[PDB]
Each structure stands twice: as structure tokens, then as C-alpha cells.
Amino acid sequence: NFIWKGFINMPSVAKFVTKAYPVSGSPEYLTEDLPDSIQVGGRISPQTVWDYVEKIKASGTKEICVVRFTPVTEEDQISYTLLFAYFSSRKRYGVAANNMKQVKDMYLIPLGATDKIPHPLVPFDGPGLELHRPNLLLGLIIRQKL
């Protein structure tokens, strides 16, 4: 019941295969809107993203989809952990650089295992996130609605 399988590729940091699972507002048609390999082209401060997200909500013209990335093999998990640490240690989110036509933005959010879910994504509309979990990379997908 995964939505998408592909690469996350951040040059000179980590490249690995992951499955994306639904968390909130993430229909399976997202598979059509994600490339084979998500290219991480930048980093951005979380507060800047949350400010943007509340303007996005006010516009009524986008859908905010949250997915959970899972490494597919033990080798993938090693790189997944590198990339989590890259963003976590800098207090940054990743920014995708190669979005398909229907995707306005995609951000990569490191969610610590005991972290509280960043409040703009609450509440989830979908399976949500379990309380007991590893360190996670979430994908915040800003998709064209109308």
C-alpha cells in the first residue's frame, strides 16, 4: 500500500531508494506527480516553510499532501540516516528541485522519533503517524488543486 517508489538524491550527501506511504491528504494519484528520482536541490528554514504553508491554505488553490518515506533495504537505510542527520543537525528542511507540472513545491522534513508533529500539518486527514516510530523523513507536497 505504498504510493510511490523511487530515489531521493541529494548530490554528495546520499542517494537511496525509498517507498512513500500516505500520512495526510495523499491520494495514490500522487504516484503520477513524483519523478523517478527526487532531486534535493536546496535547504530552507522551517519557519519560512510554515509561513508559506499558511498562505497556501488561505489561497484555497492547493492541496497539502504529507507522505512518510521508508528505506527499502539495509543499504538504503544507511543513506536515509545520513540524509536525516544532514537536515536535522542544521535545523533545515530539504527543497526538491525537479518537481513535475502538478507539484508546486516539495519539502523534506526530518521528524525525530520523539519530536512533536509540526503543528501546521496537524491534524492529519488520512492514516496519520504512529506515536512509536524511528527517525523519519516526511515529504510535504504542495500540489495544484484547481
Partner: peptide
């Protein structure tokens, strides 16, 4: 009305 994506630092 369409908010512009915020700038970010490239890596």
C-alpha cells in the same frame, strides 16, 4: 491569489 515559493539556499 497564488503565494510565491520562498527562496532557499541551494546545495
Amino acid at each position: 491569489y497564488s503565494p510565491t515559493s520562498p527562496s532557499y539556499s541551494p546545495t
